[PDB]
Symmetry: C2
Subunit: 482 residues, 2 copies
């Protein structure tokens, strides 16, 4: 959907994504070709970007250009900005909030001619249909086509464009939806937490705008206590009549046949239903295969299988699967893959085979999401992945006496990572040779010694103990650097 942005905006977005992803230096030569533009475009984009994001710290050098600051800020800032300043997205969102308005109100709202609005809507619809089956219409003003696609597009859009704590929905306050969700939580099995609750509020508020104008999806709460208080809110706040049809339209996605809200019922269906048996079998063989290969002990196999099955049988119903501008899910999995490339590549291939064998959606967005799901549901995963990594041996010596070396060694052993094993030198003599033949990865001393091949030396004479702790801790993942 980034083709809804202007050319300049699109290019600046990619420039910033590059600089946030890579901490290296970049000459304008390199930026020009990586971003497939001219050096003039790069220069113009850079100064536009400097002024738009003044907090971001840009150094220039003999080495080139880079952002120094990225660990204080976050790329969400950039998207938040390019969404906010985009004309096409703004119009689209205006239309979403104003079904039935006069086309002319849109022209007035955005200071554009009627012919310009028709050109814009034409461009918007062209971009949208590359991925989603819906379109904007001006006669009358509405969004039509595949209802599931529309609902997904906008909930995801709102999740990307607005900060987590923002509530940009003027027609619809959050409270009645919260009150409704409270009721829902008591009598159901949804996880109850801030993340899932925010996502549900966005899905539901998006669905209310559809429901208010009769745009419906093809498919206990009515007699829970409190229901009439909620039903009153909906009438008062939203002017909507809270009945069975509404409730069904709000939560349609959780009536998917192969979604199992109940874990125990899933496990029962595994025994009766040959499609479900097959899903279960594939996921069970995947999990065993990965567990044996990476020696990962897994705690609750069947619960994990249930979760993977469910995740794989939803399509454009959970947010952070498909993205508009910000592939946050994808970036998260890529960061983990940077640490553990072979592991992540193996799970992606197994899960891709799972999706393809069942003939469900097997796009990279779903492969990424499912892999992410497996990872984040797995206990002590990082411990297990690093289990073949021997401890780093650290020698500590003092030219004063051994009480000093022991004092330091004990202090560091206590405060620094248990990846390290700290020891003192126990022989009477020392020589370059006996240091070379020693097993140490790191040597800390307050006197100078010749370089010792394959040993990192920390000279500690001008370093206090606290600084030394910080310094040694920065080396805790040396083995991971192979």
């Amino acid at each position: 959907m980034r083709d809804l942005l202007s050319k300049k905006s699109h290019r600046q977005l990619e420039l910033l994504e590059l600089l946030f992803e890579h901490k290296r230096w970049f000459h304008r030569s390199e930026l020009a070709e990586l971003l497939n533009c001219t050096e003039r475009a790069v220069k113009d984009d850079l100064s536009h970007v400097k002024s738009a994001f003044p907090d971001l710290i840009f150094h220039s050098s003999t080495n080139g250009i880079r952002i120094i600051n990225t660990d204080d800020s976050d790329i969400e800032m950039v998207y938040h900005h390019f969404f906010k300043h985009s004309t096409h997205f703004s119009i689209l969102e205006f239309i979403f909030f104003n079904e039935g308005c006069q086309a002319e109100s849109i022209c007035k709202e955005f200071y554009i001619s009627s012919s310009s609005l028709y050109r814009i809507i034409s461009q918007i619809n062209k971009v949208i249909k590359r991925q989603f089956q819906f379109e904007v219409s001006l006669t009358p003003v509405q969004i039509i086509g595949n209802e599931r696609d529309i609902r997904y597009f906008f909930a995801q859009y709102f999740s990307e464009k607005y900060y987590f704590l923002e509530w940009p929905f003027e027609n619809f306050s959050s409270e009645p939806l919260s009150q409704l969700l409270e009721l829902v939580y008591k009598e159901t099995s949804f996880p109850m937490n801030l993340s899932t609750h925010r996502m549900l509020k966005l899905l539901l508020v998006t669905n209310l705008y559809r429901i208010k104008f009769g745009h419906f999806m093809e498919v206990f709460l009515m007699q829970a206590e409190g229901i009439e208080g909620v039903a009153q809110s909906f009438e008062s706040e939203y002017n909507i009549s809270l009945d069975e049809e509404v409730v069904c339209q709000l939560f349609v996605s959780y009536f998917q046949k192969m979604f199992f809200i109940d874990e125990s019922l899933f496990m029962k269906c595994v025994k009766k239903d040959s499609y479900v048996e097959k899903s279960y079998h594939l996921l069970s063989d995947f999990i065993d295969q990965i567990s044996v290969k990476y020696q990962i002990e897994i705690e609750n196999k069947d619960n994990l299988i249930w979760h993977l099955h469910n995740t794989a049988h939803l399509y454009r119903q959970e947010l952070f699967t498909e993205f508009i501008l910000f592939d946050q899910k994808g970036n998260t999995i890529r960061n983990f893959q940077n640490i553990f490339p072979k592991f992540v590549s193996d799970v992606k291939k197994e899960l891709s085979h799972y999706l393809e064998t069942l003939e469900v959606c097997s796009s990279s967005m779903m492969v990424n999401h499912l892999s992410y799901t497996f990872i984040t549901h797995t206990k002590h995963l990082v411990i297990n992945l690093l289990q073949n990594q021997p401890k780093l041996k650290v020698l500590v010596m003092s030219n004063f006496d051994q009480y000093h070396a022991k004092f330091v060694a004990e202090t560091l052993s206590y405060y620094c990572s248990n990846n390290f094993e700290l020891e003192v030198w126990t022989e009477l003599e020392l020589s370059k040779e006996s240091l070379e033949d020693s097993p140490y990865d790191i040597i800390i001393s307050n006197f100078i010694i010749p370089p010792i091949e394959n040993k990192r030396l920390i000279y500690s004479n001008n370093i206090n103990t606290v600084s030394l702790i910080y310094l040694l801790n920065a080396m805790m993942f040396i083995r991971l650097d192979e």
Copy 2:
């Protein structure tokens, strides 16, 4: 002893010590004023310094924690004709003065000037002098032996052996043989210090320069193999006089080689009892005030008593140019200024009350001794600092937050306590009201007064571990 260096060299040295000590950004006016010199002088020192030590990098200097500061001291020793001549003379007792003129390409008149100047400087601290008729070093023998052993510890690297006349091995096997038959600690540091003291003492013993004042040793196993090495390697007869002269420092009346003997002397000698009483009240006072567990008080008292009653007998107490002991205490003092100020005052009072050496050199060394003999010091010193509370949130789902929380709680300092957000709603005010010190999130929130925010979207878990651990002593700040 730095006044022995040329005025320029001396100033260049203090320049570098300032740079290495302080990380503060420096401009020429601060330097000139701090060093007490012209800006022309500072400009020229800087040029010279960069020329002499190319591997240093000035942007203020950014290399310091990674740089060979000993090489700095070596350099100034070597290029001091005064120090070089002093050393040559130490190794060449009885030579003709003309040999020194020849070796250093100087006239006899400038040699006599140099000697005068050396004697003038040394005399301020140590009561000995160099003589040219005949060529020898004379005066207080303990001062001489200390001066040179300490000089050699500062001028040469730990692994170097500058003594051409004397191999280390005969001396090693003597020490070995001594360790076996005694209570002396066996470790590389004390072993190196003893070798330097002894090799120094041998040069004195070889010309009959003796200290004014062991049976077992002469009938111990292997003594003849050792004594043969001494005769063949050093041209010296290993006897009761030599052994005594090699180890004189440890027959001090108030030095106690064994803890049990010290403790028996506490009951029968009123001076020893006084020493024990002062140290015991100091230790109790500091332990209660800073809540420090002292397990083996008597062992600590014994060590502090011993240390306080050696004078110019242990290296790294007084320095020639490089006050490494003092810098080590100053570094510790940077972290715990009040603790260190208290121990120094208590130990200064201990020393003054007994009327032993109470120089800042001895106060620094005794304080260093107290610190390094104490078990769990830093831990005890930080015990009132609460755990840092860390909140982890994800916009995806709570599994993600728990995955990250568990990984970070395992790998990061036990100074942290990681938790997830358990309420359904989040708001700026509930975050402000929360007790978290650090918030890790993959979604932007507004600044929350007094909370450090770490955003995680472009950071992998390993990077996140490094970033969190860098904050492990926030409270200490």
